[PDB]
Amino acid sequence: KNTQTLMPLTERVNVQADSARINQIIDGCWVAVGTNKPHAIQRDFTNLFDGKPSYRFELKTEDNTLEGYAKGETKGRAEFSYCYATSDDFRGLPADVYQKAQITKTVYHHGKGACPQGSSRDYEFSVYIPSSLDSNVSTIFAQWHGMPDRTLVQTPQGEVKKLTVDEFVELEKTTFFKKNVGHEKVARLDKQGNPVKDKNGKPVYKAGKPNGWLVEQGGYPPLAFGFSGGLFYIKANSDRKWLTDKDDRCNANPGKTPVMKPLTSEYKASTIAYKLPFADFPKDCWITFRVHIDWTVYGKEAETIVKPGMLDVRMDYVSKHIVDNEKILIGRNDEDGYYFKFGIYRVGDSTVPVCYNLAGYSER
Ligand SMILES: O=C(O)C1=C[C@@H](O)[C@@H](OS(=O)(=O)O)[C@H](O[C@H]2[C@H](O)[C@@H](NS(=O)(=O)O)[C@@H](O)O[C@@H]2COS(=O)(=O)O)O1
């Protein structure tokens, strides 16, 4: 009933498919993604950081709104993305550039907030973990995410090739994509033999059988900071395959994979760079992470590792050098780069409630 200390921020931008409208942008630099329940993300006027409102993220137990990897598994999301495009990013261009970017899901590739392939960048942000946070949460609170372009496809005959935007736009007319997998696009039909339309007159389609096409979509985040199994962990992922293979689920478990011993497949590596028992992670105070990433350089279609990456992390609240300039494989073999998000990404088929605050982001 006191609604003065917290301000719901409920606008959500589909950053891959839609430009952010000015009145959806937060503090001139963020848009929000994930569930839009009023408590999911709020500006917090009580817990100030550097004398300014911080951001309170909350997922209650019922707040998983996304399908997880396995049938019957779900996941939850309330995050800020530092990467999005606005209408100004398409200013003066032919109308079809934006329209085709929505269909190819490459809208945010036209916007600010990404770091290119093989680049080096410094990041800083702060987190505030309440003492009430359950030690068995399974949540990623900051991540650096790839930006694959789904115009890189595999044909039914197994050829990996780059479609032009126009070619992809044509393919999407006949193909219903379920994540990365193409299916025959089938019109649902009424009884007079006509295509069904929703209440707004929009034609409705469903997926038929797989049609052989695959597109580059999804993939693990190259870097994630989170809690799992009673540990705070930092996990780095690398994928050197030109077209990522979604079936190759090379993914280290902080509870099972020893620290700094990469788990590898033929193309992927997943490394737990740091672990700290949950009780040793400070509570009810602001912790500032300083992160330096030298992104791995990959050889594109050659699939080589041209140059290894490196990861450095400091944790201040005292300064602990928790990841000390580690040579590491980190990134994705894509044409495009990486963007930062923070918030709640509740994974591992968990519904344990999550709530904490974040603030103070910068990158250089
Ligand atoms: O770590 C994640 O946030 C995450 C990994 C992504 O690879 C993707 O996984 S997936 O299960 O959906 O395949 C989901 O990431 C993107 C997702 O790729 C994207 N789909 S797209 O628009 O068709 O390209 C969309 O669903 O957004 C999610 C998260 O991105 S966002 O939080 O910046 O919006 O989850």
Ligand SMILES: O=C(O)C1=C[C@@H](O)[C@@H](OS(=O)(=O)O)[C@H](O[C@H]2[C@H](O)[C@@H](NS(=O)(=O)O)[C@@H](O)O[C@@H]2COS(=O)(=O)O)O1
């Ligand atoms: O081992 C996995 O591949 C894996 C474990 C699952 O528990 C799943 O979490 S769940 O809540 O969806 O069930 C999970 O998380 C991945 C997710 O699959 C991936 N999407 S994809 O690459 O496009 O398929 C992406 O969003 O990253 C998350 C982070 O994985 S994590 O669980 O290791 O944190 O995948």
Ligand SMILES: [Ca+2]
């Ligand atoms: Ca790729």
